[PDB]
Design a protein around this ligand. Sequence first.
Ligand SMILES: *[C@@H]1O[C@H](CO)[C@@H](O[C@@H]2O[C@H](CO)[C@@H](O[C@@H]3O[C@H](CO[C@H]4O[C@H](CO)[C@@H](O)[C@H](O)[C@@H]4O)[C@@H](O)[C@H](O[C@H]4O[C@H](CO)[C@@H](O)[C@H](O)[C@@H]4O)[C@@H]3O)[C@H](O)[C@H]2NC(C)=O)[C@H](O)[C@H]1NC(C)=O
Ligand SMILES: *[C@@H]1O[C@H](CO)[C@@H](O[C@@H]2O[C@H](CO)[C@@H](O[C@@H]3O[C@H](CO[C@H]4O[C@H](CO)[C@@H](O)[C@H](O)[C@@H]4O)[C@@H](O)[C@H](O[C@H]4O[C@H](CO)[C@@H](O)[C@H](O)[C@@H]4O)[C@@H]3O)[C@H](O)[C@H]2NC(C)=O)[C@H](O)[C@H]1NC(C)=O
Ligand SMILES: *[C@@H]1O[C@H](CO)[C@@H](O)[C@H](O)[C@H]1NC(C)=O
Ligand SMILES: *[C@@H]1O[C@H](CO)[C@@H](O)[C@H](O)[C@H]1NC(C)=O
Ligand SMILES: *[C@@H]1O[C@H](CO)[C@@H](O)[C@H](O)[C@H]1NC(C)=O
Ligand SMILES: *[C@@H]1O[C@H](CO)[C@@H](O)[C@H](O)[C@H]1NC(C)=O
Ligand SMILES: *[C@@H]1O[C@H](CO)[C@@H](O)[C@H](O)[C@H]1NC(C)=O
Ligand SMILES: *[C@@H]1O[C@H](CO)[C@@H](O)[C@H](O)[C@H]1NC(C)=O
Lengths: 209, 118, 99
Amino acid sequence: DTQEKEVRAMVGSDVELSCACPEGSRFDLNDVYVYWQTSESKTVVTYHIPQNSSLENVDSRYRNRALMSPAGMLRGDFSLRLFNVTPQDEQKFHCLVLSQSLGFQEVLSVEVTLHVAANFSVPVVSAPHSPELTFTCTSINGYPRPNVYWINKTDNSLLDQALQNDTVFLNMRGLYDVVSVLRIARTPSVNIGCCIENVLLQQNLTVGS
Amino acid sequence: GARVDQTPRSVTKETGESLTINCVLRDPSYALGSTCWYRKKSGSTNEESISKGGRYVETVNSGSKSFSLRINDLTVEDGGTYRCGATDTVRIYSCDYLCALNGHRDAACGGGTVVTVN
Amino acid sequence: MFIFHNGGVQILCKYPDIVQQFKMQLLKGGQILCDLTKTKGSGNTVSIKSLKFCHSQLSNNSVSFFLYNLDHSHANYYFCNLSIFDPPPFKVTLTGGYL
Ligand SMILES: *[C@@H]1O[C@H](CO)[C@@H](O[C@@H]2O[C@H](CO)[C@@H](O[C@@H]3O[C@H](CO[C@H]4O[C@H](CO)[C@@H](O)[C@H](O)[C@@H]4O)[C@@H](O)[C@H](O[C@H]4O[C@H](CO)[C@@H](O)[C@H](O)[C@@H]4O)[C@@H]3O)[C@H](O)[C@H]2NC(C)=O)[C@H](O)[C@H]1NC(C)=O
Ligand SMILES: *[C@@H]1O[C@H](CO)[C@@H](O[C@@H]2O[C@H](CO)[C@@H](O[C@@H]3O[C@H](CO[C@H]4O[C@H](CO)[C@@H](O)[C@H](O)[C@@H]4O)[C@@H](O)[C@H](O[C@H]4O[C@H](CO)[C@@H](O)[C@H](O)[C@@H]4O)[C@@H]3O)[C@H](O)[C@H]2NC(C)=O)[C@H](O)[C@H]1NC(C)=O
Ligand SMILES: *[C@@H]1O[C@H](CO)[C@@H](O)[C@H](O)[C@H]1NC(C)=O
Ligand SMILES: *[C@@H]1O[C@H](CO)[C@@H](O)[C@H](O)[C@H]1NC(C)=O
Ligand SMILES: *[C@@H]1O[C@H](CO)[C@@H](O)[C@H](O)[C@H]1NC(C)=O
Ligand SMILES: *[C@@H]1O[C@H](CO)[C@@H](O)[C@H](O)[C@H]1NC(C)=O
Ligand SMILES: *[C@@H]1O[C@H](CO)[C@@H](O)[C@H](O)[C@H]1NC(C)=O
Ligand SMILES: *[C@@H]1O[C@H](CO)[C@@H](O)[C@H](O)[C@H]1NC(C)=O
């Protein structure tokens, strides 16, 4: 009885994924086993075992960021509270609820896809030249992969993508950096600029030469 | 999401003879961005980056979208466990932080290979 | 993964010694031949419930069942449903054999 849910969130922002039983009625914490884990990676986000309170098998990533509220558990609301979301937290999170009284049959299973996003730095341009000239546009720390576009600022038209070499880097924080070089022919009065696009965020950053 | 599987899971080899460890970046990953190879020594339970080239020879097929490492002239203490880290058509600054990214849609280290040389 | 003695067959199914609460089911022909379920209780007690008991001897790294019914005719694959409840993550693994 999986309920496909979608939760979009931002990095460093505390988000709440929900695993809700329709009944406002109560549950038995000494009977039920609760598991929050990723669908593919199967990494332990958090869990509830009847007779112990010390999550030692919680994964290093989620060691202290995944919290289930117990009073809400008894009320039937197994909702996870995720803190300080990181780019590696975009996963299909699976909440699974087994009742020992029914021979470990599943009473609740909900798959909550989590999308996360981040904002790139404002692009930085320069004008170094060679034989024709070259431009360098650098923007960093955004999620997911950025779309970079170059604009003929004089008339606000879009230059062809074959004029640019892009190399996106993985920041050690999971965020992305990008360096884009554009080689065009020499001309006076060539107002152009750079553009960083986060399609998930719907936000475009432009900077003139 | 995207991850990387590596073979073999466990191998025992003879001293001096080369050993090969493969790795593939499973679909629907587009292409290999950069490859890293890590090994950890028996006791300290911490990994270290294997410097490519020389004794450790790497072969990469972008068409096959898979990479392989070869060890020559195996000292008896070349044993341990070996991971390989790949990335989905993007590049990384340092290998030091590749395995530190789990479930990232653009980075995954291998399952590991256990090696004992006699 | 199993042996034949005493006009019967001992089918042993292994599991990681880490798991401390689990449910081991033996399946052949799609049918549940044997069953065992281990649980850790309060006050450091262990509960074992078995809806179909096959003289299961519970080694700490594997569970073995004994079928004194041979069923040598129509020899099928033998699967071992393994559900891991403790410790997380919860996973179900099927390992199979022949004869
Ligand atoms: C190895 O052992 C594990 C032990 O857990 C098995 O996994 C179990 O498999 C059974 C059967 O597939 C699962 O039981 C099913 O649970 C479903 C949950 O959905 C509802 O369940 C409750 C009860 O009413 C509702 O309150 C709740 O809101 C959910 O909406 C049920 O829907 C299933 O019933 C339906 O299917 C059965 C067939 O099984 C039909 O006969 C019924 O008429 C009905 O249509 C069923 O109860 C159980 O949840 C699983 N447990 C776990 C932990 O995953 C493995 O299956 C076994 N090995 C293999 C190979 O299967
Ligand atoms: C972004 O896009 C804009 C257009 O939207 C481009 O700007 C135009 O670029 C063209 C081509 O480089 C320019 O055409 C050239 O104009 C020069 C003089 O400009 C003035 O000329 C007329 C009067 O003669 C004025 O009305 C006009 O407003 C301009 O102020 C000429 O000297 C050039 O001559 C060269 O070409 C001709 C024909 O090819 C040859 O006969 C000559 O020998 C010489 O080789 C040429 O005609 C146009 O003027 C530009 N206009 C503006 C407003 O910029 C940008 O170049 C483009 N930028 C990028 C980065 O893509
Ligand atoms: C969240 O974690 C990051 C590093 O993971 C840290 O820089 C930051 O201070 C933490 N807290 C907040 C509120 O961002
Ligand atoms: C409680 O008991 C054991 C030993 O501490 C451990 O394996 C188990 O995961 C613990 N769980 C919780 C939720 O404290
Ligand atoms: C530009 O990028 C391409 C790949 O798109 C690469 O082959 C090439 O080495 C880069 N540099 C130049 C100068 O083309
Ligand atoms: C961002 O810029 C690109 C390139 O011009 C454009 O195709 C896209 O629609 C823009 N989106 C927004 C929200 O500005
Ligand atoms: C991120 O980029 C936006 C829009 O592209 C811009 O206004 C600002 O620099 C940042 N702030 C947001 C999240 O509003
Ligand atoms: C439990 O099994 C392990 C192997 O996983 C073994 O080393 C140990 O002796 C066993 N302990 C018992 C049976 O108490």
